[PDB]
Design a protein that fits this description.
It is classed as hydrolase. 4 copies of one chain form a homotetramer. The first copy, chain A, is an alpha/beta fold. Helices cover 28% and strands 28% of the residues of chain A.
Chain lengths: 511, 511, 511, 511
């Protein structure tokens, strides 16, 4: 039975799970929800949200508490629980970097600054981030990761785990790079030929080749090479797809490297990370920018022909929920919300002050609607045929171009009937829509707090007819019909409110 | 066992069901609630509202999806469900016209503008309404309707179905008539002698005879003849009563024909429709005019000596509920509310934003009260002896003339006791009353949010005595006594609030 | 086993029930709650209120619907239900007068103005009140009442029924007396010697003897003689205690006789009614005057050495509940609230807009507290040893004189602890207290929303000691101890809130 | 099995219960909740609050109602109930003084001012407080207390009762001392040599030695000697630890002795009470001063090297709950809240208007958190290693000095994440924290509505590492691990909200 795998060719991408494209509808537990005694506050929240994939930390300190003495008992417990609760897993390897720092490395690592040295600032101060240049730290992380991947292969032939995230938001706060002598000797050397080629530059030293950006590009390359070697060695044991996640710099008015985590896969060093990381399948943004223009711009920059869009983390405040459909609209591999458990922790002001059934309901709506047709939606994404949009404040109408024949008007905050006047939008921005092209004249359509009005895009389709507007669900790939919408229910577009409904709409023209 | 039948003589009317007059307390599901997979969101709402009759679409596209290949399986399912849930059915034939358009005609009809042509505007544009002049469209609709009536006769000897509505709001938006050559050849001809007689006019062409109104009267006659031939052929197979429903034009400031649906049974062409439709039992208004003066004027215009009043549709917003009793007061055959299911569709702003137990309670109150004496109420209506009224904003008192001996004062928003000052009315208009004359000195009385004070109408009855004020219910026609109201409960009229109560009041005089 | 009986000597009174004094904690159903089919809306309300005595109409129209054809089946049903629900009964004979009118007399009475004539005004108009002067009406009422009392004796040896109320608010609206010739012949005659004696006047005609008040005194005497003869004949069959109830005239600014019900036992003709009614045990006020000064003045006027105070009716709005204890403080026989059922009738503005568990809770509190010591409370009342008071708006302190040794300060709206400043009173007037003197130094004390502070009334008791402050209840006459209040619970008086608590307080002095 | 015992040496103290230090998390029932018939309104409240120790009055009037006739049946019942409900008991001997007065002494005491004389004012008036100088009153109280201690020893080998409180707030209101001749003869004599030594003064009379404070110091010494002799005699029978409780005088602006209870253990006569009371283990404040500066100053004054801090009573209004942790921070023996039952009594304005699950929740939070590590917390207190603090209005940050190596910053009203700007504090003051030093680099930490940020206190610990931040609970002394907090949960201190959580935090430094 085929194991999970990431494919990408000519800018079309698929996460293949059980032999077909898959879309991650993800939930990530909080950072300290990775022990047997706390899982009873994880699963009741997942039951409410209904993700198809759960992200859980696997901490280096817990799997190798003493060097050479491995303990994967929590991985085993977690696989049983995920199988019982019918979710797939994405495991997060909290090791050399977690939010730039060594806090999840074991005692014998993070207390030993001699064997495992920290970044040194230009002024000579050690700071809370391990240097990518130390061979001992790479060796020890990679050895632990290799034991981890070997264990996974032995106990997960069911393929419950579909991806691995090596490290978590690697990079450095408080310095653009390491300035230790160890670092300076490498920085003074020649830029590796692989990076010279990919960057369209002439050979030379780091300062010669990259100028004012040499410090930041050097640090990104060195972190990338570090994680790539870990990815390559772990894949040699069990070749699950692997991705790294990015602490973002501001898309419009970024600060200086070091204010944001320098060296991480920020939007200015994506080609460096690509060159450095051939064994890393994608670079995934962690988006905690709730403002529409910022969020959607991050989506556009990380969705590249060489980079499948996966939103590995985003906020759990309700205004975030609507960003699922525009993410899927970039035809990547999915979207995950962060902080989904009942441990009473809150990452406000990034996310919600409390996680409960009310705060989860806007997310569960989208997860239920996509799950009603997940495999066809994922087939569409893998062919580049998924369209998605979310409501922007002060803009009550959007236009989606679908193909030569049809377009869709998206209108927010209107009745499900004729109305007089300009569309007002919803009082808060909460609407969204998602449209899959199955064939030129047939679409899968869902939305919430929104009207979707399909209309001709050319003179050939001016004589538009609703042939069928079928409500139903999919069982795997088999369509289960419930009813044909007609009359009032199609006279004013098709109108969605607060319940999950999937429509398979076949259009015709009269002749 | 006698089948349902409509009788009318000298301006008195009855819908005979199971051998006696019947009054429809109706509920209509939304337009796309006509498939097996959605009926579990219909019946729980009917359980709350408690109609005695449910209206459900029977779509041409679903019973003849391919020409000649009939499928009445949903009709069969629906008859079983109506029998289990103890309601009668009125079936709506969604075919050549539904809200003026062909959207419920099958694929092989509504995509074939050659065989089944659309109305052509004066400027040459085909628009979304099938021409009444095409023989193929009439033939195909009638053939489907005949198969439908034949099936009904075979599977409904219980007579669950009591009426059929051929077509739904036939007429045309965007043109006063068809201007195609096919239409013009008929328009240029002589007005049929049947219409010339009924309209008190001299023979001639359509333009000669009817002048400025020729276009609209021609279209109404041609639609009427179309549906009448379908009614006649269907009745030849199974002679259930049949009615058509009207999309109204404004009673006071109507627009132009084509702004409102031209050719439908609007209030200016009722004699045309009568002349054209001898096999159509009545013309029924669909009233979505919530303002008192408009609603009640529509009632008066459609209640004619040659037209039994049936309100086939009205709004499901709570202010509409009170219009049941004035409708029954015209001594027709009943009243039905539109959009009664839990599918989460809303036709706001015509109706309510949500359908739930709260929004249905004002309707259920009236349906429960009338059902407590439905057969005697319907016997009264068939003798012209039913009186009914609803509260008008800014008018806290109304006077009902009952007969030579007695009248009833209706007072809104007062205590059930002595009060000082002018009656204030209810804060919102919600009151109503219904009074049946059983014999000169005995009345059935119910109401809500209202006081009913019977008082002498002549010097012969000045010495008024409450002989009996019996609360109870009817089992069929047998009166079941609960108690005699007296004392406080009759000193200030008889006072109704929010619970269904039927009173049988016998008056006397002391001597 | 002794039957119920009213005793009164030297201004001390007792309703003896089962051989000992009894205090009525009464509830009266609404006027049309006197049929088997409505009793399921009576008993659930009594379960909440918990009266010890229920008042129910027994209508002449229902027990003699045709002359000579008696039907006491409802009396039988009602006795079974009262025994099952553990209440005593007071039966109300709705006959010649109910609120001045004949509406509860049978068909063959109230429609026959010839045999049973109405009062004639000075101008010659018959009005809605039967003349006390017609021998046929007296004969027919008395005959029905005699059949009623005979039936009671046969089917009620349990003595469920403890009193009878002949007629209901007898009197006349719209005329001071009857002016018919039948009436004038009697009015022109001599004042009966019995009334001449009791009124301390010299013999003469009605106009000579009574002057400007002759009309009103004549009507009161004639109604009184009418009901007295009915009482005497009914008592000859079964000598239950009997009382009449009064529709009050204003205590301070009364209107004219005829505006209020002339001839009823109003506060100006109590000596007339005493003289006329030796077989009527007491004259009971019906108090719907919610203002403190009016309510308590009515109490004082009807509590006479020759008249035991029984409040036969009062309002069911919550502000009325507190008037129970000052009524008991006049050492009569009890107090009853009117309109206690769930039939959805309201006599607002006299009483509450709705009867439910919230509106009944302030009454149930008092009924529960008195029931916790009802027989000792009733023994105290029969010895004149009960003291009671209710809160007056704007007066947060009252002083009750108990005996030579002790007094009680009643304070409203204070904490159950030390407080600074003037007592504020409760926000609405809701407090009350009730104190029985068991012996010179021992008292039964209860209250609600109030503090009771016992304190010395003389120099002999200056050295006051709380010997015992026992919370408990009585079983019949046997005291069941729960706890001794001390400390905080007695440092600031004894403080009552919203739960029923009976305290048996023994005082001492240190020496 | 060792019985409870109080140990104190060189300013470190422990209440030894079952052989190890113990911390009282106490609840006291109201003053009249000391009878079998009211205990069903005590235990349901204790179930909600969850104290480990309940204080209950044992009244002299109830155990010796007649002289020589002892009745300890309630003590027996109460021991059974405390064992069933799993709490320890502290019994309060309500005898010669309760809130200065004799109200709980038996009838034959408090009514006999001859045998048991009251304090006489300077003007000759007897007032409500028994004189400490009468030998009969001492003899009779001591005899009753000796019978009580003998009974306890016989029926409590389980050691359910851990301390006894002889008398309750002894002292006098309305006079600084007794001025009777009996008192004056003693006052005129020489100051006992024991008091002369302890007060660092020269021999002489009371007026010579103490001057303006002679009256108050004389009264405190005489009350102290009275209770000490009772303590000594009771301990001779069963040597349970014993304490007296104090009605406080204002810490900053005290009134005159007699306005506050003169002679009680107020903050100016603590050395007198120590000298007079060698058999009294500690002097405990009763703190009903809700203002932060007053409450915490009282704590400081009563926590002395010769006086273990026990807060025997405090308010049950929610603002009081947070004072538990600063009390424990003085390394005494515990803290108890007053008025914890459902009898519907309120000592507002000292405490809450109602006791229910809402008003108890802020207290239950602290009791649950301390109970999760009660024995280690009590071991820490006995070594002087407990630190505790509560939030002060207008101060959102506090600093706790722990040892040479570490300190803790306490921040109130902040998110559990990074925030911009000055800490706002909670809207009402509700935060607190409690920190036990287990060893130099390991701490037990709990709090609520607060952030605790451990940080270096010296250059030696500048390179701080969170080695482990373990959430769990203790079973007795055995630690039960749940999870290791890391990541978000430790990046911004450790953050507590509204649920009980105990963290065992081991700190390291990197090298």
């Amino acid at each position: 039975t085929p194991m999970p795998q990431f494919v990408s060719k000519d800018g079309k991408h698929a996460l293949m799970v059980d032999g077909a494209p898959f879309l991650i509808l993800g939930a990530q537990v909080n950072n300290s929800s990775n022990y047997p005694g706390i899982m009873d506050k994880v699963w009741p929240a997942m039951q409410v949200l209904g993700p198809n994939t759960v992200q859980v930390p696997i901490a280096w300190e817990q799997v190798e508490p003493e060097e050479g003495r491995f303990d994967f008992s929590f991985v085993d417990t977690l696989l049983n629980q995920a199988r019982e609760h019918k979710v797939r897993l994405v495991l997060l390897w909290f090791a050399t970097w977690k939010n730039n720092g060594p806090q999840y490395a074991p005692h014998w690592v993070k207390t030993d600054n001699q064997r495992f040295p920290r970044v040194v600032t230009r002024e000579g101060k050690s700071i809370g981030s391990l240097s990518p240049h130390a061979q001992a730290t790479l060796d020890a992380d990679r050895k632990a990761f290799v034991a981890f991947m070997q264990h996974l292969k032995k106990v997960d032939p069911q393929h419950t785990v579909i991806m691995i995230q090596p490290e978590n938001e690697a990079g450095t706060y408080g310095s653009v790079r390491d300035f230790s002598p160890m670092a300076q000797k490498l920085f003074d050397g020649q830029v590796p030929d692989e990076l010279i080629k990919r960057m369209n530059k002439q050979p030379g030293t780091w300062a010669q080749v990259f100028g004012a950006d040499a410090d930041e590009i050097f640090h990104a390359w060195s972190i990338g090479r570090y994680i790539d070697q870990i990815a390559q060695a772990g894949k040699a044991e069990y070749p699950l797809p692997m991705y790294v996640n990015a602490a973002l710099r501001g898309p419009f008015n970024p600060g200086q490297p070091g204010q944001y985590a320098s060296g991480g896969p920020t939007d200015n060093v994506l080609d460096v990370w690509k060159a450095a990381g051939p064994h890393i399948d994608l670079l995934a943004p962690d988006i905690y920018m709730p403002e529409y223009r910022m969020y959607t711009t991050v989506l556009e920059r990380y969705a590249r022909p060489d980079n499948a869009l996966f939103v590995a983390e985003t906020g759990n405040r309700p205004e975030y929920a609507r960003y699922l459909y525009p993410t899927l609209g970039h035809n990547g591999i999915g979207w995950s919300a962060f902080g989904i458990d009942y441990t009473r922790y809150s990452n406000y002001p990034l996310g919600a002050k409390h996680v409960n059934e009310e705060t989860l309901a806007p997310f569960a709506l989208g997860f239920q609607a996509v799950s009603m047709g997940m495999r066809p939606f994922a087939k569409a994404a893998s062919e580049g045929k998924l369209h998605g949009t979310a409501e922007e404040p002060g803009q009550a109408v959007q236009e989606l171009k679908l193909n030569d024949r049809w377009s869709a008007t998206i209108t927010y905050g209107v009745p499900q009937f004729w109305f007089k006047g300009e569309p007002p939008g919803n009082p808060e921005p909460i609407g969204a829509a998602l449209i899959a092209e199955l064939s030129p004249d047939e679409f899968l359509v869902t939305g919430y707090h929104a009207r979707v009005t399909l209309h001709p895009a050319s003179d050939a389709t001016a004589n538009m007819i609703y042939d069928r507007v079928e409500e139903g669900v999919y069982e795997g790939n088999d369509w289960k019909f419930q009813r044909n919408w007609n009359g009032d229910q199609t006279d004013y577009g098709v109108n969605f409110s607060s319940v999950p409904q999937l429509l398979k709409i076949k259009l015709a023209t009269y002749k």
